[PDB]
Amino acid sequence: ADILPANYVVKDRWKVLKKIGGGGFGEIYEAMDLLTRENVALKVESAQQPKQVLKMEVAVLKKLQGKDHVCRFIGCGRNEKFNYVVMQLQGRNLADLRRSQPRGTFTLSTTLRLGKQILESIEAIHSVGFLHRDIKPSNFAMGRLPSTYRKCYMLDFGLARQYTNTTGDVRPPRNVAGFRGTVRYASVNAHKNREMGRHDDLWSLFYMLVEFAVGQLPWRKIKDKEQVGMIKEKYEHRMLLKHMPSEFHLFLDHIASLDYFTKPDYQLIMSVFENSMKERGIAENEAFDWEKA
């Protein structure tokens, strides 16, 4: 029941090698580019699928071309059986890299430098009028070339939503919006089924970086969406920062102050990461934890 079989050739050019991801709303393959001879990522959506989301994902990817932390767009197409997008292939995701560490923790040097790259990518998608709405470690992947192996890329615009109108104004929020994303890194606003905003993507970043540095979140053993929301709603969030740099209070206080309508202070959050690095003599050119160095 896979949309493309192995060795299936798309548009006489992209030859399916294997499936590398899958879910309700489509499938991702590693393919060989029979023209440029590199391997690529080939993402497909059934032509029959009721919710046609790939067209929006491609529009977002095209708007982001020229930004850092963005997969190169190679091509896209539509036919009677499937829609597809061809993009730059990336490597190891941050969730797998964190689980591979001895205590499931990154150093503060790896955590802060990843934080800077993820924040850049979040500001980038916001800058073209979209929310990601499922910011989580498995949606960020390190490069797989000499030119990219220390670069972190944003993946999966499947749950993204335009927060502006045709003319660049902020859209009215729906009084109820069903949160359909991942439980562990969801904001309290998402748990309450409120329209998500730019701040909710930064809430997900906040929770990610605590988990990277400390190795866990307090609710990690609880899978039920309602229970997790009730735990987060009361949790004294300053407690999450007991073993984090003190600058992180500025980050917590800022995003706590935001509502659906308010543009975040991305530079304030960047300065938290940069000041936390400078205080501890952490340089940008340092080895990541997973490197031999």
As a dihedral over the C-alpha atoms of residue 144, residue 148, residue 150, residue 154, rounded to 10 degrees, the angle is -80
Question: Is residue 261 within 8 Å of 104, Cβ to Cβ?
Answer: no
21 annotated binding-site participant? yes
Task: Confirm or deny that 23 is annotated as ligand binding.
Answer: yes
Pick the closer one to ligand IQY by CB: 84 or 206. 84
Check 2, 12, 68, 134 and give the catalytic one. Answer: 134
Q: How far is the CB of 66 from ligand IQY (least distance, A)?
A: 15
In angstroms, how far is the first alpha carbon of the chain from the final one? 43
d(CA 195, CA 282): 38
Q: Closest CB to ligand IQY among 71 and 131?
A: 71
- What is the distance between the alpha carbons of residues 154 and 191, in angstroms, rounded to a whole number? 23
Residue nearest to ligand IQY (CB): 21
In Å, how far from its chain's centre is CA 175?
A: 26
- Residue 134 catalytic? yes
Q: How many CB atoms lie within 10 A of CB 159?
A: 19
The answer on whether 122 is annotated among ligand-binding residues is: no
Residue 94 vs 240, nearer CB to ligand IQY: 94
The secondary structure element, H or E, covering residue 272 is: helix 266-279
Residue 41: closest CA among 91, 78, 115: 91
**Tokens coding 259:** 């509502």
DSSP-derived secondary structure letter, 265: -
Question: Is 104 assigned a ligand-binding role in the annotation?
Answer: no
Enumerate binding residues for ligand IQY (CB under 6 A). Answer: 20-21, 28, 41, 43, 57-58, 61, 71, 85, 87-90, 141, 155-157
Task: Find out whether 24 is annotated in a ligand binding site.
Answer: yes
Q: Give Cα 34 distance to the centre of its chain.
A: 30
Question: What is the nearest approach in angstroms of ligand IQY to the Cβ of residue 222?
Answer: 25
What is the smallest separation between the CB atom of 206 and ligand IQY, expressed in angstroms?
Answer: 22
At closest approach, how far in Å is the CB of 251 from ligand IQY? 25
22 appears as a binding residue in the annotation: yes
Cβ atoms of 82 and 46 closer than 8 Å:
yes
Measured from the CB of residue 29, what is the shortest distance to ligand IQY in angstroms? Answer: 10
Residue number with CB closer to ligand IQY (59 or 188):
59
Count Cα atoms within 13 angstroms, Cβ side, for 219: 24
Of residues 245, 284, 249, 268, the one with CA closest to residue 123: 268
Sign of CA pseudo-dihedral 69, 74, 79, 82: negative
Q: Pick between residue 26 and residue 115 the one whose CB is nearest to ligand IQY.
A: 26
Select 28 or 205, whichever has its Cβ closest to ligand IQY.
28
Residue 248 in marked binding region:
no
Compute the least distance from the CB of residue 237 to ligand IQY, in Å.
30
Binding-site positions for ATP read: 20-28, 43
- Could you give the residue numbers annotated as active site? 134
Binding-site positions read: 20-28, 43
